[model samples]
Target: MEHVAFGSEDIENTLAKMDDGQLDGLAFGAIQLDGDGNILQYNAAEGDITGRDPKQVIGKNFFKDVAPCTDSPEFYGKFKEGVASGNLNTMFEYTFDYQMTPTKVKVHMKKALSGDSYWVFVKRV
Candidate 1:
C-alpha cells in the first residue's frame, strides 16, 4: 500500500478504505472519533505518541476523558463545528500539555466520507 502522508490532499479517500492493520501502521497518530467526541478507533501510533493505550481509550470521550486539555473552544469547538457542517476538514498547530510532557503537533481533523466518524490526524513537529 502507498504511504499516506499527513496533510495530503484527498486523504479522506485513502483513509476511508483502510482497515485496522493499515491504520495502525501509520507513523503519525490517527484517531477516529464519533460525532459526539467519543473515540471509535485509536491507532497504535497514536497510543505510542500520546502515551495512552488504545485498549483503554477506544470507547472514551476524546475531548473529555482522553484529552481534556482539548475540551475547550479552540479544539473541541472546531470538532463540534465540523460535525455540524458535515464537512470537517481543518488543520492547525496545537500543544498537548495537560498531564504529560508538552508535545507540539500539527493536527488535522477530517470527517470521513464513508461513515459517521471524524479522523483526527496528529504529527509531531
Candidate 2:
C-alpha cells in the first residue's frame, strides 16, 4: 500500500479522489464508515484483498457486511458502547480467515464530522 502522512484535510481530499484503479492496487482493503458503523465506501483493493466484491459490500452495514467476523457481542457491542460514550479513536488487531487463508488485519477508527460521517482505513499484515 502507498503510505504518506498528510493533514486531515488532505486525507479527506484524497479519499474523495479514490477510484477503481487506485483501490485495486492497495495491498489491503480500505473502508470508509460512518459514525454509526455504516459503510460508506468499500474499495476494489478491499475486494481483491478479501476475495469479495464491492457489489456485495458498499451500502451494507460495516459490522454486518464487510466484517461479520467482528459482529459478536464482545466486538460490535463494545464498539457501539464506546461510540455512545463519545470515544474518539479506537483501534485493535484481529485475525480472520479469508477464503480459507488466514489473514491478519489492523484497524484504525476515529470520529470525524467533516461531513456527516467518519472513515476507517484497513491495512493487512
Q: Please list the C-alpha lDDT of all candidates, in the order they appear.
A: 0.88, 0.63
Please provide TM-scores, in order, for all candidate models, with all chains considered together. 0.94, 0.67
Runs of candidate 1 exceeding 4 Å displacement:
none
lDDT of 1 at 49: 74
**Best model number under TM-score:** 1
| Candidate 2 residue spans exceeding 4 A from truth | 1-28, 98-100
Error of 1 at 107 (Å): 0.3
Clashing pairs in 1: none
Which residue pairs clash in candidate 2? none
Across 48-102, the per-residue lDDT of candidate 1 in tens digits comes to 7788988789899998888999988988999999998888888999999877999
